Amino acid sequence: EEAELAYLLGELAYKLGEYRIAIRAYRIALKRDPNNAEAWYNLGNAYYKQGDYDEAIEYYQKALELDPNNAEAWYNLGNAYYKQGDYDEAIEYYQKALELDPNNAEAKQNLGNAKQKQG
Amino acid sequence: EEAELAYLLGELAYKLGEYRIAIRAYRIALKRDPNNAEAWYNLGNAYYKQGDYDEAIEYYQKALELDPNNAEAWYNLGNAYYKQGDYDEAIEYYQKALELDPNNAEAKQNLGNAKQK
Amino acid sequence: EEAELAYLLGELAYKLGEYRIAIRAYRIALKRDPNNAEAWYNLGNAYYKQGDYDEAIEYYQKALELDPNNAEAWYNLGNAYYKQGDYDEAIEYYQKALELDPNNAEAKQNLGNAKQKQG
């Protein structure tokens, strides 16, 4: 229904790089369905893509409280910490991402980058 | 009104090559308005664009039950059969398309291709 | 809520050059929220982009009754009259546009074009 339409609009907007429109659409989705883990996750991505890492972190966290079994969320949480030079936290979350999804090449590369920093 | 929004979102998604999103949106439109022939037709196109010809066929057929006088639907039904090498069926539907719309070149070209196979 | 969704869809469609979809979406938005000046304005732009200048004019006019302090709207109203050869009206609205936004060099150029077309 309308929340699903809002969600689809946000995804479409996101995929086309219209992050402000994605955010406004995901907000409508979340107003209607506040416990939608995937909407929080995607709102997080939209903020991430705009360089707003603190907001991304907050919404990734919210998504993971609702659904901790989202490997990609753990991974992006890692990235957002990495981009702020919080290498400890990035390492913790990349590792959690890999515990859930050992095949995430990207998380493995970034884990390695983060481990090499820190020092 | 919600059905129209769903439909517009599906068209937008389709036009931009986001077929999965188009399908999900058109399904919401059809849930609200199951007699919308153009939504069935477009759902068909979205599946066609993804290479899922059997599904495309099913939805083209549904669209044509609702609007049998719609030459473009007959034409796309033809194409979907053609892409699966069902040349007999493609010929029947291209011909039906042309019986309704003697112009539209494309169905005429494809009819010729199919007949040659 | 539905009005906002319709509006977001219209914006998204507009930004991507899908003007027919934008028009249909903005119509739904305005049906739900007829006092949205920015929706009237954008419906106007969508019709303008399609070459439907009489419709553009109608919706610009509506937008400006609701928000007269929108300089860019006065300017586009001017353009739409210009494209139909209503040079008097184009001149009046370009002038109004400049009274509100003296830095609109485009409106100044077009004002000059219109003044020339009419002798």
Numbering used by the authors:
A (entry chain A), C (entry chain C): 1 to 119
B (entry chain B): 1 to 117
Please quote the paper that reports this structure.
We sought to develop a general computational method for de novo designing protein nanoparticles with geometries tailored to present antigens of interest, focusing specifically on the prefusion conformations of the trimeric viral glycoproteins HIV-1 Env (BG505 SOSIP), influenza hemagglutinin (H1 HA), and respiratory syncytial virus (RSV) F (DS-Cav1). In the first step, we de novo designed antigen-tailored trimers, featuring N termini geometrically matched to the C termini of the viral glycoproteins. In the second step, we generated tetrahedral, octahedral, and icosahedral two-component nanoparticles by designing secondary interfaces between a designed trimer (fusion component) and a de novo homo-oligomer (assembly component). This design approach yielded nanoparticles tailored to present 4, 8, or 20 copies of the viral glycoproteins in defined geometries.
We chose to design our antigen-tailored trimers from monomeric repeat proteins composed of rigidly packed 20- to 50-residue tandem repeat units, as their high stability and tunable length (through variation of repeat number) are desirable properties for the design of protein-based nanomaterials. Geometrically compatible docks (non-clashing termini separation distances of 15 Å or less) were subjected to full Rosetta C3-symmetric interface design and filtering, and twenty-three designs were selected for experimental characterization. Four of the designs that were trimeric and expressed in high yield, 1na0C3_2, 3ltjC3_1v2, 3ltjC3_11, and HR04C3_5v2, were selected for solution small angle X-ray scattering (SAXS) experiments. The proteins exhibited scattering profiles very similar to those computed from the corresponding design models, suggesting similar supramolecular configuration. Crystals were obtained for the two designs 1na0C3_2 and 3ltjC3_1v2. Structures were determined at resolutions of 2.6 and 2.3 Å, revealing a backbone root mean square deviation (r.m.s.d.) between the design model and structure of 1.4 and 0.8 Å, respectively. The structures confirmed in both cases that the designed proteins adopt the intended trimeric configurations, and that most of the atomic details at the de novo designed interfaces are recapitulated.
